[PDB]
Amino acid sequence: APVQGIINFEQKESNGPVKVWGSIKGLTEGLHGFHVHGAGGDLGNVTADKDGVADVSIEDSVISLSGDHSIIGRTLVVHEKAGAGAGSRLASGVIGIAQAGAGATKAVAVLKGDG
């Protein structure tokens, strides 16, 4: 699709905070809803510039890469429609494991839309 991105997740310790970073390209200029599908995975909004590129760099302590609240295998979603509220046009990708063990974990979501 036009909308593409790579988002990385990193966690040092079981309950420790999760670093989320990467970039999403092919977006319309403005704010885009950004979250893990389902409960307990709101990652706020990402801002796409005039080139349609949104650089992402956040830390969140609600999400995790281990335990029952683990986002591993869940779907990461960005709303292609700018601005808050609902939207059915999504770029998305499953959060996959990159590295794991002993305590530390890394994951990657490849975001792809349609167009």
PDB file of C-alpha atoms in Angstrom:
ATOM      1  CA  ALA A   1       0.000   0.000   0.000  1.00  0.00           C
ATOM      2  CA  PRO A   2       0.956   3.674   0.126  1.00  0.00           C
ATOM      3  CA  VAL A   3       0.916   3.426   3.953  1.00  0.00           C
ATOM      4  CA  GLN A   4       3.885   1.466   5.298  1.00  0.00           C
ATOM      5  CA  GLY A   5       5.868   1.453   8.520  1.00  0.00           C
ATOM      6  CA  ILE A   6       8.099  -0.438  10.898  1.00  0.00           C
ATOM      7  CA  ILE A   7       7.528  -0.182  14.654  1.00  0.00           C
ATOM      8  CA  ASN A   8       9.939  -1.644  17.205  1.00  0.00           C
ATOM      9  CA  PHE A   9       9.174  -2.617  20.812  1.00  0.00           C
ATOM     10  CA  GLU A  10      11.825  -3.205  23.497  1.00  0.00           C
ATOM     11  CA  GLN A  11      11.540  -4.320  27.110  1.00  0.00           C
ATOM     12  CA  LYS A  12      14.441  -5.086  29.454  1.00  0.00           C
ATOM     13  CA  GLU A  13      12.467  -6.625  32.348  1.00  0.00           C
ATOM     14  CA  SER A  14       9.188  -8.514  32.892  1.00  0.00           C
ATOM     15  CA  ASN A  15       7.165  -5.557  34.238  1.00  0.00           C
ATOM     16  CA  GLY A  16       9.605  -2.894  32.999  1.00  0.00           C
ATOM     17  CA  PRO A  17       8.546  -0.121  30.614  1.00  0.00           C
ATOM     18  CA  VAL A  18       8.345  -0.737  26.860  1.00  0.00           C
ATOM     19  CA  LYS A  19      10.236   1.484  24.414  1.00  0.00           C
ATOM     20  CA  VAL A  20       8.262   1.919  21.165  1.00  0.00           C
ATOM     21  CA  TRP A  21       9.962   3.460  18.146  1.00  0.00           C
ATOM     22  CA  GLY A  22      10.051   3.536  14.355  1.00  0.00           C
ATOM     23  CA  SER A  23       8.447   5.394  11.463  1.00  0.00           C
ATOM     24  CA  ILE A  24       5.260   5.233   9.401  1.00  0.00           C
ATOM     25  CA  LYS A  25       5.222   6.587   5.844  1.00  0.00           C
ATOM     26  CA  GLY A  26       2.546   7.364   3.253  1.00  0.00           C
ATOM     27  CA  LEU A  27       0.215   9.030   5.781  1.00  0.00           C
ATOM     28  CA  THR A  28      -1.843  12.191   5.298  1.00  0.00           C
ATOM     29  CA  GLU A  29      -0.582  15.217   7.239  1.00  0.00           C
ATOM     30  CA  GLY A  30      -1.830  15.434  10.843  1.00  0.00           C
ATOM     31  CA  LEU A  31      -2.648  13.260  13.864  1.00  0.00           C
ATOM     32  CA  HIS A  32      -3.304   9.523  13.459  1.00  0.00           C
ATOM     33  CA  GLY A  33      -4.711   7.157  16.098  1.00  0.00           C
ATOM     34  CA  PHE A  34      -2.108   4.593  17.126  1.00  0.00           C
ATOM     35  CA  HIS A  35      -2.807   1.540  19.295  1.00  0.00           C
ATOM     36  CA  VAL A  36      -2.820  -2.209  19.780  1.00  0.00           C
ATOM     37  CA  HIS A  37      -6.144  -3.798  18.816  1.00  0.00           C
ATOM     38  CA  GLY A  38      -8.131  -4.812  21.917  1.00  0.00           C
ATOM     39  CA  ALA A  39      -7.946  -3.633  25.532  1.00  0.00           C
ATOM     40  CA  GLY A  40      -4.966  -1.998  27.268  1.00  0.00           C
ATOM     41  CA  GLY A  41      -2.908  -0.878  24.273  1.00  0.00           C
ATOM     42  CA  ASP A  42      -3.603   2.811  23.635  1.00  0.00           C
ATOM     43  CA  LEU A  43      -0.402   4.380  22.273  1.00  0.00           C
ATOM     44  CA  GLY A  44      -1.978   7.806  21.718  1.00  0.00           C
ATOM     45  CA  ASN A  45      -1.559   9.566  18.387  1.00  0.00           C
ATOM     46  CA  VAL A  46       1.312   9.807  15.924  1.00  0.00           C
ATOM     47  CA  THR A  47       1.963  13.017  13.978  1.00  0.00           C
ATOM     48  CA  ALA A  48       2.658  12.771  10.251  1.00  0.00           C
ATOM     49  CA  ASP A  49       4.547  15.708   8.695  1.00  0.00           C
ATOM     50  CA  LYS A  50       4.005  17.294   5.237  1.00  0.00           C
ATOM     51  CA  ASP A  51       5.989  14.435   3.637  1.00  0.00           C
ATOM     52  CA  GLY A  52       3.488  12.007   5.218  1.00  0.00           C
ATOM     53  CA  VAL A  53       6.133  10.599   7.561  1.00  0.00           C
ATOM     54  CA  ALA A  54       5.434  10.052  11.245  1.00  0.00           C
ATOM     55  CA  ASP A  55       8.491   9.400  13.399  1.00  0.00           C
ATOM     56  CA  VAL A  56       7.565   7.416  16.512  1.00  0.00           C
ATOM     57  CA  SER A  57       9.428   7.381  19.849  1.00  0.00           C
ATOM     58  CA  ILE A  58       7.534   6.636  23.037  1.00  0.00           C
ATOM     59  CA  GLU A  59       7.781   4.754  26.293  1.00  0.00           C
ATOM     60  CA  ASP A  60       4.758   3.068  27.816  1.00  0.00           C
ATOM     61  CA  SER A  61       4.379   1.150  31.090  1.00  0.00           C
ATOM     62  CA  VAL A  62       0.842  -0.166  30.459  1.00  0.00           C
ATOM     63  CA  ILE A  63       1.764  -2.493  27.578  1.00  0.00           C
ATOM     64  CA  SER A  64       4.207  -5.381  28.028  1.00  0.00           C
ATOM     65  CA  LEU A  65       6.066  -7.955  25.904  1.00  0.00           C
ATOM     66  CA  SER A  66       5.568 -10.731  28.491  1.00  0.00           C
ATOM     67  CA  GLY A  67       2.845 -12.043  30.824  1.00  0.00           C
ATOM     68  CA  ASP A  68      -0.938 -12.123  30.356  1.00  0.00           C
ATOM     69  CA  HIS A  69      -0.940  -8.483  29.191  1.00  0.00           C
ATOM     70  CA  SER A  70       1.666  -9.296  26.497  1.00  0.00           C
ATOM     71  CA  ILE A  71       1.104  -7.547  23.158  1.00  0.00           C
ATOM     72  CA  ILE A  72       3.166 -10.188  21.327  1.00  0.00           C
ATOM     73  CA  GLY A  73       0.966 -11.630  18.576  1.00  0.00           C
ATOM     74  CA  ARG A  74      -1.551  -8.784  18.830  1.00  0.00           C
ATOM     75  CA  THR A  75      -2.242  -6.425  15.945  1.00  0.00           C
ATOM     76  CA  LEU A  76      -0.748  -2.930  15.878  1.00  0.00           C
ATOM     77  CA  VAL A  77      -2.985  -0.387  14.161  1.00  0.00           C
ATOM     78  CA  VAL A  78      -2.660   3.134  12.784  1.00  0.00           C
ATOM     79  CA  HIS A  79      -5.713   5.028  11.517  1.00  0.00           C
ATOM     80  CA  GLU A  80      -5.082   6.171   7.943  1.00  0.00           C
ATOM     81  CA  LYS A  81      -7.746   8.867   8.362  1.00  0.00           C
ATOM     82  CA  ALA A  82      -6.267  11.884  10.181  1.00  0.00           C
ATOM     83  CA  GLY A  83      -7.943  13.232  13.331  1.00  0.00           C
ATOM     84  CA  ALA A  84      -9.547  11.557  16.345  1.00  0.00           C
ATOM     85  CA  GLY A  85     -12.586   9.257  16.544  1.00  0.00           C
ATOM     86  CA  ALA A  86     -13.389   6.094  14.611  1.00  0.00           C
ATOM     87  CA  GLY A  87     -11.963   5.068  11.251  1.00  0.00           C
ATOM     88  CA  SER A  88     -12.163   1.872   9.203  1.00  0.00           C
ATOM     89  CA  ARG A  89      -9.158   2.520   6.910  1.00  0.00           C
ATOM     90  CA  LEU A  90      -6.240   0.962   8.798  1.00  0.00           C
ATOM     91  CA  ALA A  91      -2.610   0.180   8.212  1.00  0.00           C
ATOM     92  CA  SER A  92      -1.785  -2.752  10.476  1.00  0.00           C
ATOM     93  CA  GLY A  93       0.559  -5.582  11.345  1.00  0.00           C
ATOM     94  CA  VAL A  94       0.983  -8.376  13.854  1.00  0.00           C
ATOM     95  CA  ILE A  95       3.516  -7.723  16.612  1.00  0.00           C
ATOM     96  CA  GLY A  96       6.165 -10.424  16.151  1.00  0.00           C
ATOM     97  CA  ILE A  97       9.057 -11.555  18.327  1.00  0.00           C
ATOM     98  CA  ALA A  98      12.536 -10.427  17.294  1.00  0.00           C
ATOM     99  CA  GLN A  99      14.596 -11.450  20.337  1.00  0.00           C
ATOM    100  CA  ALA A 100      13.733 -13.144  23.641  1.00  0.00           C
ATOM    101  CA  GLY A 101      15.718 -14.294  26.696  1.00  0.00           C
ATOM    102  CA  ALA A 102      16.562 -14.221  29.467  1.00  0.00           C
ATOM    103  CA  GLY A 103      14.642 -11.214  30.803  1.00  0.00           C
ATOM    104  CA  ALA A 104      14.946  -8.904  27.781  1.00  0.00           C
ATOM    105  CA  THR A 105      12.565  -8.945  24.799  1.00  0.00           C
ATOM    106  CA  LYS A 106      12.410  -7.220  21.409  1.00  0.00           C
ATOM    107  CA  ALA A 107       9.457  -7.203  18.981  1.00  0.00           C
ATOM    108  CA  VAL A 108       8.657  -5.731  15.554  1.00  0.00           C
ATOM    109  CA  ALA A 109       5.418  -4.825  13.758  1.00  0.00           C
ATOM    110  CA  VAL A 110       5.496  -4.289   9.990  1.00  0.00           C
ATOM    111  CA  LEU A 111       2.580  -1.969   9.187  1.00  0.00           C
ATOM    112  CA  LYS A 112       0.849  -2.283   5.814  1.00  0.00           C
ATOM    113  CA  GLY A 113      -2.374  -0.642   4.610  1.00  0.00           C
ATOM    114  CA  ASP A 114      -4.279  -0.886   1.323  1.00  0.00           C
ATOM    115  CA  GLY A 115      -4.108   1.218  -1.859  1.00  0.00           C
TER     116      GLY A 115
END
